[PDB]
Design a protein around this ligand. Structure first.
Ligand SMILES: Nc1ncnc2c1ncn2[C@@H]1O[C@H](COP(=O)(O)O)[C@@H](O)[C@H]1O
Ligand SMILES: Nc1ncnc2c1ncn2[C@@H]1O[C@H](COP(=O)(O)O)[C@@H](O)[C@H]1O
Ligand SMILES: [K+]
Ligand SMILES: [K+]
Ligand code: NA
Lengths: 246, 243
């Protein structure tokens, strides 16, 4: 449990006024895991910190690169070469000194996913950009009823107003989600039920993909960050709904 | 014109692969003004910097407050008490050391708007949260054909997926936009044309307001800023393509 300080109420008074006092405590007591701290995940982590989430785990083994500058909140001249997750953790500690931040300097694999998820998270935000670990994470959380929201590919898109949430089985214009569905089926026996759903919530966009315009898909902050923000809003909404139901 | 360095191409290669080389050059050559560096404007400024916009002016006179923490990108423990616009300017120089960043430590008034807009901006992003200077800024840019995107109320809302852009005359569920229309009409003679349009593009949300001095969330206020920036870039690219 987290005791909400007077400082915490100064930082997050606007949160309490928007979501309610019960939600402020719910968020303070929550532990959310963000897997992948890149074009989508770095903004998700920022949003969690700024909405009074009391414990955040960040999982990534990558370093900050100069080419991250177009789409990642931690990508600053002075951060290049440092571990992404550690850089983001330090920022979170500046946002909320009372937030409990854990860094896992690793990638999720079929072999370690149970270990890393054994912490008992309130929610998992899957912002992984490669299919093999993404499938392992999703299959595990789905099997174990761990609340999860995943994100499709956020590159090759310029319009943030077309971003929305649907079941993973129903995404369009998203090659990553399409590969992911194939891998879930072939490697984990995850297939859609009678209603044509996989039972996995996925942030995606109706926008037709914009192919590389210069000599891999490009990306923009305005879209990749909004993927991350929509994932966070979705998660908090589901957490509040569950709490109201119990 | 701006000569794009090797360093610039490394930072914004992803931008070039999304929008094209001509647009990369267009952005590098652009000068965009953000008025109000708060819950909406700070994220707009961030987005401009990370999309290779070559010159950015920031206008705000307020300081970073601890109560900004829920919704403003510059609100960090070590920044509290410093001028928002200078903090954001310093951050932009960390994003792109070659960006030409100007800080105007002031608020826009009917009396100073001409001076501050005479610079010749490629686009103005209006992220002011109070009606009187907001109307004055919009009236001036509209009269002078200065490209402008304005933002409605972003507080009291939890759903980023209902944010959109339309003409200011057609917004709904937005008390700030409604007040703004009234003040524009009464004080500046700005009224709807034959097609029912004011000729002002407005970012707003269809979401019904949530009453508790509204609360706010980063996920929504930042997305207002991002949508404003994407809208401006879309219009800039279209104009360049016409010509
Ligand atoms: N298996 C994994 N576990 C954790 N993070 C990952 C994994 N695979 C990829 N990521 C991260 O996801 C991010 C993708 O960002 P982007 O380049 O914007 O697609 C990068 O920071 C990667 O290091
Ligand atoms: N007349 C004005 N000119 C420039 N900036 C302003 C003006 N009025 C308000 N602002 C700023 O707009 C921001 C609004 O942010 P928020 O508190 O999230 O609504 C604050 O940083 C204000 O200081
Ligand atoms: K899409
Ligand atoms: K609204
Ligand atoms: Na939308």
């Amino acid at each position: 449990s987290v005791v909400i300080s007077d400082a915490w109420r100064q930082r997050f008074g606007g949160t309490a006024r928007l979501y309610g006092e019960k939600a402020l405590q719910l968020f303070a007591d929550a532990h959310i895991c963000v897997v992948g701290i890149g074009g989508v995940g770095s903004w998700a982590a920022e949003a969690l910190a700024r909405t009074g989430i009391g414990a955040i785990t960040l999982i990534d083994m990558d370093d900050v690169c100069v080419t991250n500058t177009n789409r990642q909140i931690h990508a600053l001249r002075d951060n290049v070469g440092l571990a992404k997750a550690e850089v983001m953790a330090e920022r979170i500690r500046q946002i909320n000194p009372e937030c409990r931040v854990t860094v896992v300097d690793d990638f999720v694999t079929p072999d370690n996913v149970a270990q890393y998820m054994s912490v008992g998270y309130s929610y998992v935000i899957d912002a992984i950009d490669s299919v093999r670990p993404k499938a392992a994470l999703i299959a595990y959380c789905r099997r174990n009823k761990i609340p999860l929201v995943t994100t499709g590919g956020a590159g090759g898109q310029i319009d943030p107003t077309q971003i929305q949430v649907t079941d993973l089985a129903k995404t369009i214009q998203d090659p990553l989600a399409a590969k992911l569905r194939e891998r879930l089926k072939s490697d984990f026996g995850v297939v859609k039920n009678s209603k044509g759903k996989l039972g996995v919530d996925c942030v995606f966009s109706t926008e037709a993909l914009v192919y590389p315009q210069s000599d891999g898909f490009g990306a923009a902050t305005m879209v990749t960050a909004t993927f991350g923000f929509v994932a966070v809003s979705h998660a908090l909404k589901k957490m509040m709904a569950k709490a109201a139901r119990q």
